[PDB]
């Protein structure tokens, strides 16, 4: 009961953060009809959460060293929970944007602390391997459950969708309070100048990329804000040389296999993210499943995901992370090839759509556990904070970049086969077929990106003694 | 009875040529101890067969049009059978070289004609699908049976190994005489200037490539002969513009998928050849099975490959050659990866060495049949000759090129890990472990080359209606 309560509590913010984003996307069309925030306001509710979430993420890495990881985890979750109630009673667009900003601040604090608590709470060995599986397990549970909740009670009101976080957030605070322990160690003074410039450098960049498409890539505020991001980054690196308790220990990233590992998670996160966004759109638009049915149809992915995670936790103590990552992805690679050839519109569910999802889930489950363990290997307690924060930022940063490339490819080929850009409800059924074939073509591009992750994963070179088996 | 006799006869030259090369390699050390031909003559017996086999191969493609494909097939096999007898009674090195030169001429005349007999003898449909499987099936039978025969009857005398072809060559000539019919079509005038220049260019290129390492890549005769190869190649292309019944119809290779299909077989042949050469050396050297035991241990490969060929012949009428080539090699890609991680010295036979061979054999069998049917698709009867000759030449040319790259990578990592260049019998057992891991490393490079074949195979685009299903 004690070990079970601890692993569930540590992975709580992965459940909440992934579930909230999926619900917010689902309920966007109605928030127009009620608030009338217009097409401009459509993207501010999304970008507001991402503006502070990425900006303050590297500040939240070092906030557990100077104050405490258990306190930091609880405070971040509590602020996230409170902000969800305020977002559910937003009067107009203005109230909603402040609400989404505060959720990003709370998530920026608790997300890095959750992955740091995995390394510092469970000693290397079977304990850390079981905890790693649960931490990655609940990220998929929240994603699928966000569809089901986002598709089930959407029909009544979008305000009840943001209140579902409140019961869940309260349970994670209670579990973390009575299951986690405060470490009795002296605090480290926070790096003021290093922490400030990192927030300014990151926040300005996120703002510039988000507003760029709205005003154009050469509007003047797009590259004008990029100038501030560049100037802040240059000043951050210079002061970082003579920094005490540094925010980003550049020296810890050398020519060894830490860069290879951290290069994989950035590009792997892009493949995982773009595969999730494209598949959801295809099932909703082409196959006409709807939000509720799509969420219930992805339940087998979670069960398949769990089987891969559970098997990998046992095998990680006998096989190096190199073979397990390759072995798991080989199953995933076959699943995407099958879908790229035999996934037209109107196919049945059980034979065609279930098996590739089940096979792909086991492959992903096998590869995530070795990669997470090697990302937190050979670090310690005085540098686990920033290293865990860097891991989550690269995973999230690689999402939008790879997906941006993929979506451009899908759009281009839809016009090539003969099609239109715009809402799917006004297509001629000859223009809908072109969109279908475009999505499967873009799945080959995702396969090419996955292959590059594999060759870069051949250079890891960690033994099962270092990542696990201690 | 008439059908089985016809398919066996057409593939007879594939069994003989593949069997002869394997037997010739096995018996080279003993030919040294008897004839005392020195190391220089050791390689001349091999190059003599290839010098005329590759030099005259393109000539034989158009020889069946002006003489007849049945008469051309009997003449080539007959000359091959006679020369094997002359090779078995060679008293000095001169007699052996002229004997090996004659065998290449016989193989050059019959090898292109055998593949052209597949397209002309059997109508497009299930009959041609079954004939193609048998044609590919007994190319593999000769290789494994060459090990068994060469490794068995070479503790008595190496001369007897060359007489084993005589019974087989006689049987194929009888079957071809009583099972094939001579087409009644008017003969075509041979392209005199085009044929002589094509022969001179191909022989000179082989000569310079073979003699280069002996005399050095800049000896004076190496690049001296390469000068003649370039001059003959240029003149061949110019005169082919105004050539009637061209030896190489360049216009038949446009931007369509004929180039993609013919580029796949070039590099696919290289992957197959280097995979066969390296696996044989590893089994004999690292594992120490010997030639006889190695041949008996590769019997499951032929059985496994027969299943792949038999299954693929049925499926080729419903699925395009694109998916079958990708589907078959996906099994082969996994087999190479498993052998690249769990294949050290001292492992048993049935658990570790049998299964990857069986899985790889089925994958190879699945992809061979679709590639062969698309290489002889949509040509006719007045150009099937030269097109079949080009298909075999690219397959044979790709072997040495890819294997040269692989063997260079093997040698470099042997020295890097700590190793010695020389015979394997003078090794320290610490120098022998380095050679073990060099071979396992090179298997990753063969898998990387296979991936390139796959992406290049995604551009084929043939439908099952064209290659088969008639
Ligand atoms: C090289 C420099 C590159 C820096 C660029 C950063 C741009 C931020 C991402 C783009 C903003 C808008 C889109 C978006 O982000 O959305 C995805 C997700 C929310 O999920 P969604 O709501 O989309 O739901 C899913 C739906 O189903 C599908 O539509 O947010 C994220 O995690 C984004 C990662 C950003 C956080 C970490 C890094 C930020 C700081 C940059 C450091 C370098 C600058 C330093 C100088
Ligand atoms: C990385 C290491 C970490 C180290 C660094 C430390 C970080 C630790 C974190 C670990 C957690 C990672 C994995 C978590 C998984 C999350 C994804 C998820 O659980 O979500 C499921 C998704 C639903 O997405 P949603 O719909 O909710 O959101 C989209 C909106 O709807 C649209 O805006 O779908 C799926 O089940 C994906 C199935 C993939 C299987 C293989 C593909 C087979 C091909 C079939 C043909 C398809 C047609 C072609 C189409 C092209
Ligand atoms: C000294 C000390 C080292 C010094 C530092 C080196 C750092 C690395 C740089 C090179 C990394 C690039 C890798 C190569 C690449 O860029 O290319 C991919 C590779 C090459 O071969 P290709 O076939 O691509 O060759 C065609 C050419 O690319 C065209 O020129 O591919 C492979 O062989 C990999 C086999 C495994 C793939 C199958 C399994 C999937 C992988 C797992 C995914 C898990 C997902 C995670 C789930 C979250
Ligand atoms: C410019 C250069 C021209 C092209 C080079 C061709 C390679 C020659 C063979 C080199 C000798 C060793 C390798 C070898 O020969 O092995 C393959 C096979 C017999 O196997 P082996 O009996 O050697 O045993 C195997 C051992 O285990 C491994 O060494 O021979 C062949 O088919 C080789 C190609 C000849 C057929 C057609 C292409 C030649 C004409 C080129 C035309 C373009 C020029 C234009 C101007
Ligand atoms: C292409 C389309 C055509 C269109 C154009 C028209 C042309 C039509 C032709 C069709 C015929 C093609 C295929 C025929 C197959 C021939 C090969 C064969 O039948 O021969 C078997 C070979 C024995 O070779 P030999 O010994 O005789 O000769 C070597 C000397 O001994 C050395 O000098 O072995 C094998 O069974 C290969 C097994 C591969 C399985 C996959 C790999 C698994 C990895 C396991 C770990 C291994 C250790 C690592 C090691 C690195
Ligand atoms: C108008 C006319 C049309 C235009 C003409 C185009 C011609 C072809 C050129 C491109 C072909 C090269 C392919 C690209 C490549 O080289 O790349 C492989 C590709 C991409 O991924 P990469 O990551 O490598 O891309 C590189 C990175 O960009 C480096 O930076 O991979 C795939 O998706 C392929 C999946 C299939 C492989 C698995 C199955 C095995 C294949 C069968 C072999 C059977 C053997 C036969 C036995 C006989
Ligand atoms: C459907 C028919 C016409 C088959 C033709 C397929 C080609 C049009 C596609 C198939 C796979 C594609 C490749 C798949 C993956 C990549 C990886 C891609 O690399 C990245 O994904 C980097 C993106 C990033 O890192 O941000 C560059 C293009 C390339 C080679 C693509 C080039 C074009 C290819 C060969
Ligand atoms: C202990 C460390 C050094 C091992 C890490 C593995 C890498 C050193 C190897 C693994 C496979 C290799 C790749 C395997 C295959 C190829 C194909 C090769 O493509 C070919 O053109 C070869 C075949 C041909 O010549 O036709 C180019 C290099 C590359 C990408 C190799 C580059 C180096 C890689 C990634």
Please tell me if residue B454 touches chain A, with a CB cutoff of 8 Å: no
CA–CA distances in Å: residue A148 to residues A45, A360, B154: 21, 21, 72
SS3 assignment, position B155: coil
Coil, strand or helix at B369: helix
Tokens representing B89 are 């009674």
Taking the C-alpha atoms of residue B422 and residue B285, their distance in angstroms, rounded to an integer, is: 12
What is the C-alpha to C-alpha distance for residues A337 and A356, in angstroms, rounded to an integer?
9
Question: Is the backbone of residue A91 left (phi > 0), alpha (psi -120 to 50) or beta?
Answer: alpha
**Per residue, what are the HEC states of chain A?**
CHHHHHHHHHCHHHHHHHHHHHHHHHCHHHHHHHHCCHHHHHCHHHHHHHHHHHHCHHHHHCHHHHCCHHHHHHHHHHHHHHHHHHHHCCCCHHHHHHHHHHHHHHHHHHHHHHHHHHHHHCCCCHHHHHHHHHHHHHHHHHHHHHHHHHHHHHHCCCHHHHCCHHHHHHHHHHHHHHHCCCCCCCCCCCCHHHHHHHHHHHHHHHHHHHHHHHHCCCCCCHHHHHHHHHHHHHHHHHHHHCCCCCCCCHHHCCCCHHHHHHHHHHHHHHHHHHHHHHHHHHHHHCCCCCHHHHHHHCHHHHHHHHHHHHHHHHHCCCCCHHHHHHHHHHHHHHHHHHHHHCCCCCCCHHHHHHHHHHHHHHHHHHHHHHHHHHHCCCCCCCCHHHHHHHHHHHHHHHHHHHHHHHHHHHHHHHHHCCCCCCCHHHCCCCHHHHHHHHHHHHHHHHHHHHHHHHHHHCCCCCCHHHHCCC
How far apart (Å, rounded) are the C-alpha atoms in residues B10 and B372?
15
Name the B residues in 6-35 with CB < 8 Å from any A CB. Answer: none
A155 contact partners, CB below 8 Å, separation of at least 6:
none
Paired tokens of A27:
């309920």
Give residue limits of the domains in chain A.
1-191, 248-470
Per CATH, B1-191 and B248-470 having the same topology is answered yes
Gap between the Cα atoms of B85 and B68, Å rounded:
26
Q: Which ligand gives the minimal distance to the CA of A404?
A: 7
Residue pair B71/B180 in contact (Cβ under 8 Å)? The answer is no
Kindly state the DSSP code that residue B220 receives in the 8-state scheme. S
C-alpha A158/C-alpha A39 separation (Å) is 18
Q: What is the DSSP letter of B251?
A: G
Pick from B323, B337, B455: CB nearest A326: B337
The ligand placed nearest to the CA atom of residue A284 is 2
Report how far residue B140's alpha carbon sits from residue B133's, in angstroms, rounded to the nearest whole number. Answer: 11
Cβ proximity of B112 and B389 under 8 Å:
yes
DSSP character string of B163-207 = HTHHHHHHHHHHHHHHH------------HHHHHHHHHHHHHHHH
Which of B326, B444, B451 has the CB atom closest to A337's CB atom?
A: B326
Report the atom number in ligand 8 closest to the C-alpha of A455. Answer: 35
Distance CA A77, CA A180 (A): 14
Say what the alpha-carbon torsion angle B135, B139, B141, B147 is, to the nearest 10 degrees: 170
Q: Do B341 and A323 touch (CB under 8 A)?
A: yes
CB-CB contact of A151 with A26 (8 Å): yes
**Does residue A5 contact residue A126 with C-beta atoms inside 8 Å?**
no
Closest CA to B337 of B345, B329, B348, B327: B329
**Preferred mutation among A322, A339, A341, A461 to probe B, highest tally of B CBs within 10 A:** A341
Task: Please classify residue B468 by burial: count the beta carbons closer than 10 Å to its beta carbon, then call 0-12 exposed, 13-18 middle and 19+ buried.
Answer: buried
Own/partner contacts of A252-258, CB < 8 Å, gap of 24 or more, are: A252/A383, A252/A387, A257/A459, A257/A460, A257/A461, A257/A462
Structure token pair of residue A390:
């860097």
Using CA atoms, how far apart are residues A290 and A284, in angstroms rounded to an integer?
A: 5
Query: Which residue pairs, CB below 8 angstroms and at least 24 apart, start in B28-37?
Result: B30/B154, B30/B158, B31/B96, B31/B158, B34/B158, B35/B90, B35/B92, B35/B93, B35/B96, B37/B93, B37/B96
Write b or e for each residue in B22-47: b if 16 or more Cβ atoms lie within 10 A of its Cβ, otherwise e.
bbbbbbeeebeeebebeeebeebbeb
- Alpha carbon of B61 to ligand 4 centroid (Å): 18
Q: What are phi and psi of B76, to 5 degrees?
A: -65, -45
Structure tokens at B216: 């050095």
* Cα B393 from chain centroid (whole Å): 9
Q: b/e for A307-332, b at 16 or more Cβ within 10 A?
A: ebbbbbbebbeebbbbbbbbbbbbbb
Residue B55, class by beta-carbon neighbours within 10 Å (0-12 exposed, 13-18 middle, 19+ buried)?
Answer: buried
Which value in Å is the resolution of this experimental model? 2.7
What phi and psi, each to the nearest 5 degrees, are found at residue A106?
A: -65, -40
Domain B1-191 class in CATH: mainly alpha
d(CA B154, CA B152): 6
Q: Which residue has the tokens 């060469």?
A: B150
Do B340 and B440 contact (CB within 8 A), yes or no? yes
Closest CA to B73 of B181, B159, B160, B146: B181
CA–centroid distance, B247 to ligand 3, in Å, is 43
For a mutational test of ligand 3's pocket, the pick from A254, A261, A336, A455, i.e. the residue with the most ligand atoms closer than 8 A to its C-beta, is A455
A58 touches A248 (CB < 8 A): yes
Report chain B residues whose CB lies below 8 A from the CB of A333: 330
- Any idea which ligand is nearest the CA of A140? 2
Q: Ligand 4: which of B58, B104, B206, B247 to mutate, judged by most atoms within 8 Å of the beta carbon?
A: B206
Chain A residues inside the 8 Å CB shell of B323 = 341
Residue B229 to residue A262: CA distance in whole angstroms: 51
- Judge contact between B460 and B257, C-beta under 8 A: yes
Kindly report the protein residue whose alpha carbon is nearest to atom 39 of ligand 4: B54
Phi and psi dihedrals of B319, rounded to 5? -115, 145
CA B113 – ligand 4 centroid, Å: 20
* B290: helix, strand or coil: coil
Name chain B contacts of A341, Cβ cutoff 8 Å.
323
Best CA proximity match to A272, nearest among A390, A409, A403: A403
* Interchain contact A330–B (C-beta under 8 A): yes
Residue B272 CB contacts under 8 Å (≥ 6 apart), including other chains: B364, B399
Q: Which residues does chain B have within 8 Å of residue A451's beta carbon, measured at their own beta carbons? A: 451
Of B214, B311, B329, B213, nearest to B267 by C-alpha is B329
3-class DSSP assignment, residue B243: coil
Q: Of B469, B136, B127, nearest to B309 (Cα)?
A: B136
The pair phi, psi for residue B431, each rounded to 5°, is: -70, -25
Alpha carbon distance B207, B52 (integer Å): 10
- The CA angle A60-A64-A68, to the nearest 5 degrees, is 145
Which atom in ligand 5 lies closest to the alpha carbon of residue B26?
31
Q: Round to whole Å and give the CA distance between A32 and A27.
A: 9
How close, in Å, is residue B447 to chain A by CA atoms? 11
How many C-beta neighbours within 10 Å does residue B435 have? 23
Return the best residue to mutate from B445, B446, B449, B452 for the ligand 8 pocket (most ligand atoms within 8 A of CB): B445
Helix H or strand E encompassing B316: none
Contact check, Cβ <8 Å, B330/A323: no
Method: cryo-EM
**What six digits make up the tokens of B274?**
């280097």
The residue contributing the CA closest to ligand 4 atom 36 is B54
Token reading at B417? 């890990």
Structural contact between residues B406 and B278, judged by C-beta atoms closer than 8 angstroms: yes
Q: Which of A365, A362, A358 is nearest to A339 (CA)?
A: A358
Ligand 5 midpoint to CA B432 (Å): 24
A416 near B CB under 8 A = no
- Residue of B319, B337, B359 best to disrupt the A interface, most CBs of A under 10 A: B337
DSSP assignment string, B378-398: S--SSSHHHHHHHHHHHHHHH
Of residues A326, A337, A455, nearest to B330 (C-beta): A337
Per the document, the length of chain A is 470
Sequence-separated (6 or more) residues with CB below 8 Å from residue B323 = A341
Q: Do A326 and B334 touch (CB under 8 A)?
A: no
Distance B345 CA to ligand 1 centre (A): 49
Nearest CA, atom 25, ligand 7: A402
- Give Cβ neighbours of residue B33 (< 8 Å, ≥ 6 apart): none
CB B88 within 8 A of CB B187: no
Query: Who's near B344: CB < 8 A, 6+ residues apart?
Result: B436, B440
The whole-angstrom separation of Cα B455 and Cα B453 is 6
What is the 8-class DSSP label of residue B286? T
| DSSP code string of B100-151 | HHHHHHHHHHHHHHHHHHHHHHS-TTHHHHHHHHHHHHHHHHHHHHHHHHHH
CB atoms within 10 A of CB B422: 9
d(Cα B204, Cα B145) in Å, to the nearest integer?
A: 33
C-alpha B172: how far from chain center: 20
Identify all chain A residues contacting B319, using CB atoms and an 8 Å cutoff: none
Q: Tokens standing for B322?
A: 């694109």
The dihedral through the CA atoms of B390, B393, B399, B402 has a sign that is: negative
> How far is B125 from B136, CA to CA, in rounded Å?
17
Q: Dig out the tokens for B144 from the structure.
A: 């494994």
Q: Which two tokens stand for residue B94?
A: 């001169």
Q: How many CB pairs under 8 A join A and B?
A: 15
Q: Which CATH class is domain B248-470?
A: mainly alpha
Atom of ligand 5 nearest to the CA of B294: 26
A341–chain B Cβ distance below 8 A for any pair = yes
What is the distance, to the nearest Å, from the Cα of residue A102 to the centroid of all Cα atoms in its chain?
18
3 state SS of B241: coil
Task: Confirm or reject contact between A451 and chain B (CB < 8 A).
Answer: yes
C-alpha angle B228/B231/B236, rounded to 5°?
120
Interface probe with A: pick from B453, B455, B460, B464, most Cβ of A within 10 Å: B455
- CB atoms under 10 Å from CB of A280, counted, come to 20
Rounded distance, CA A365 to CA A360, Å? Answer: 9
Comparing C-alpha atoms, which of A15, A4, A303 is closest to residue A130? A4
Instruction: Name the residue of chain B whose CA is nearest to A455's CA.
Output: B448
Q: Find tokens 């005085």 and name the residue.
A: A382
Instruction: Calculate helix-pair angle for B93-121, B69-87, nearest 10 degrees.
Output: 160
Residue labelled with tokens 């973390």: A176
Distance B285 CA to ligand 5 centre (A): 17
- Within 8 A by CB and 6+ apart from B93, the residues are B35, B37, B41, B44
- B259: helix, coil or strand? helix
Say which residue the tokens 């998916």 belong to: B323
What CA–CA distance (Å, rounded) separates B152 from B166?
17
Structure tokens at B445: 């490079």
Cα of A54 vs centre of ligand 1, distance in Å, is 7
Contact B460, B325 (CB under 8 A): yes
Contact B326 A334 (CB under 8 A): no
Helix axes B431-457, A431-457, angle to 10 degrees: 170
* Cβ atoms of A446 and A278 closer than 8 Å: yes
Q: B65, B245 in Cβ contact below 8 A? A: yes
Instruction: Tokens for A449, please give them.
Output: 């990106």
The 10 Å CB-count burial string (b at 16+, else e) for A70-95 is bebbbbbbbbbbbbbebbbebeebee
Contacts of B41 (CB under 8 A, 6+ apart): B35, B93
Contacts of B448 in chain A (CB under 8 A): 455
Residue A302 and residue A134 in contact, taking contact as beta carbons nearer than 8 Å: no
Q: Quote the CA–CA distance of B191 and B193 in Å, as a whole number.
A: 6
What is the DSSP code (8-state) at residue B347? Answer: -
Asked if A66 and A190 count as a contact pair (C-beta separation under 8 A), the reply is: yes
Q: How far apart are CA B419 and CA B430, in angstroms?
A: 8
Running DSSP on this structure, what letter comes out for residue B353? Answer: I
């Amino acid at each position: 009961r004690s070990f079970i309560a601890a692993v569930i509590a540590i992975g709580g913010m992965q459940l909440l953060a992934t579930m909230d984003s999926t619900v917010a996307i689902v309920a966007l069309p109605k928030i127009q009809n009620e608030l009338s925030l217009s097409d401009a306001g459509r993207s501010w509710v999304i970008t507001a959460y991402v503006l502070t979430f990425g900006g303050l993420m590297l500040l939240g890495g070092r906030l557990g060293d100077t104050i405490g990881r258990k306190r930091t985890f609880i405070v971040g979750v509590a602020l996230f929970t409170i902000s969800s109630v305020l977002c559910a009673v937003a009067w107009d667009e203005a109230t909603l944007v402040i609400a989404r900003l505060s959720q990003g601040v709370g998530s920026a604090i608790a997300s890095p602390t959750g992955l740091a608590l995995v390394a510092t709470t469970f000693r290397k060995g079977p304990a850390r391997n079981a905890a790693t599986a649960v931490f990655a397990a609940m990220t998929a549970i929240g994603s699928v459950m966000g569809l089901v909740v986002g598709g089930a009670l959407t029909e009544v009101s979008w305000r009840w969708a943001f209140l579902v976080n409140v019961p869940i957030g309260l349970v994670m605070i209670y579990l973390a309070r009575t299951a986690l322990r405060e470490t009795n160690k002296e605090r480290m003074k926070l790096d003021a100048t290093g922490a400030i410039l990192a927030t300014l450098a990151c926040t300005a960049a996120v703002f510039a990329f988000s507003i760029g498409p709205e005003k154009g890539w050469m509007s003047g505020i797009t590259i004008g804000s990029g100038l501030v991001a560049l100037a802040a980054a240059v000043a951050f690196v210079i002061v970082e040389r003579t920094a005490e308790n540094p925010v980003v220990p550049f020296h810890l990233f050398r020519d060894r296999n830490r860069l290879v590992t951290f290069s994989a998670i950035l590009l792997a996160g892009g493949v995982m993210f773009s595969l999730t966004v494209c598949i959801g759109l295809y099932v909703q638009d082409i196959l006409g499943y709807s939000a509720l049915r799509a969420g219930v149809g992805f339940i087998p992915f979670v069960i398949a995901m769990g089987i891969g995670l559970g098997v990998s936790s046992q095998l990680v103590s006998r096989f190096s992370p190199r073979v397990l990552t390759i072995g798991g992805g080989y199953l995933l690679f076959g699943a995407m090839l099958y879908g790229s050839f035999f996934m037209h519109r109107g196919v049945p569910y059980f034979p065609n759509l279930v098996m590739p999802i089940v096979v792909g889930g086991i492959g992903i489950g096998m590869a995530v556990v070795p990669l997470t363990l090697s990302a937190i290997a050979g670090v310690g307690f005085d540098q686990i904070g920033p290293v865990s924060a860097i891991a989550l930022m690269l995973q999230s940063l690689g999402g939008p970049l790879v997906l941006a490339v993929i979506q451009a490819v899908i759009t281009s080929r839809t016009l090539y086969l003969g099609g239109t850009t715009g809402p799917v409800k006004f297509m001629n059924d000859v223009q809908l077929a072109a969109l279908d074939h475009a999505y499967t073509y873009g799945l080959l591009w995702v396969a090419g990106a996955a292959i590059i992750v594999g060759g870069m994963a051949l250079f890891i070179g960690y033994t099962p003694q270092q990542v696990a088996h201690a």
